[PDB]
């Protein structure tokens, strides 16, 4: 169907960042232990909390 | 491969080349085809050769 309003619409320059989703998705349950404190360890690299 | 391009790049480049499409009803979908791995009834085969001459 016809649209009521009208739209400013056209070519434009964009660009891409670095913080992609796969480095930020992170979840954990009952994993590695730090020997000093008996708590879950840090770091997305070694599967932290 | 030997070029200064990579291989799946060449693949996605290949993927958009259209082909002749008259008798496309005659062949069958691979999902419905009883066979496995591209019988002559369900697919066609392509060979490309280039050289650095």
């Amino acid at each position: 169907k016809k649209l009521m309003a009208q739209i400013f619409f056209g070519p434009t320059y964009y660009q891409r960042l670095r913080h992609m989703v796969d480095d930020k998705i992170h979840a954990r349950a009952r994993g590695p232990m730090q020997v000093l404190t008996r708590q879950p360890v840090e770091g997305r690299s070694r599967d932290g909390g | 491969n030997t070029t200064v391009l990579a291989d799946e790049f060449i693949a996605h480049r290949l993927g958009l080349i259209p082909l002749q499409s008259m008798d496309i009803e005659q062949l069958e979908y691979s999902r419905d085809c009883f066979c496995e791995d591209h019988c002559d009834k369900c697919s066609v085969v392509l060979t490309l050769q280039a050289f650095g001459e």
């Binding site: 891409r16 913080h19 989703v21 796969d22 930020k24 998705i25 | 990579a6």
Partner: protein, 147 residues
């Protein structure tokens, strides 16, 4: 779109917008710890190591490296180490045989998966066996990218 979100055309993504390479590197090298004999880049057998991973070590070759161009999953192994001590009752003391590994083989980061490419090896500053690899991985843009 609300509060600066974005609607996109997945058909344009299929046509080939915003596709991207991703190179990652690795630093690895050997040491002298004796009684001067250094480590080795061996291909592990079943009876080779100490405390072996579940790396499914078939992707390596006789030089202890991976041939380029094959695909790797996240947990897969690429390098192989072995402890050269000499003297610590080398392969008959406090362990089975499984000779002298204490194996510190580097797996890939367990999420990303792709194609290894163009593995180079060259001696370091003092002269050792020093190894760098590079893995290539396509990342198609997805729902959660910062634009």
């Amino acid at each position: 779109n609300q509060e600066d979100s974005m609607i996109m055309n997945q058909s344009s993504i299929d046509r080939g917008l915003f596709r991207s390479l991703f190179f990652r590197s690795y630093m690895d090298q050997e040491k002298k710890y004796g009684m001067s004999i250094t480590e080795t880049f061996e291909k592990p057998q079943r009876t080779n190591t100490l405390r072996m991973k579940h790396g499914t070590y078939d992707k390596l070759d006789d030089d202890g490296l991976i041939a380029p161009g094959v695909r790797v999953s996240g947990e897969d192994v690429i390098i192989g180490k072995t402890t050269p001590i000499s003297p610590d009752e080398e392969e008959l003391g406090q362990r089975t045989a499984y000779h002298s590994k204490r194996d510190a083989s580097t797996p890939l980061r367990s999420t990303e998966n792709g194609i290894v490419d163009q593995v180079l090896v060259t001696t370091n500053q003092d002269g050792l066996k020093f190894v760098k690899v590079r893995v290539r991985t396509t990342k198609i843009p997805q729902i959660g990218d910062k634009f």
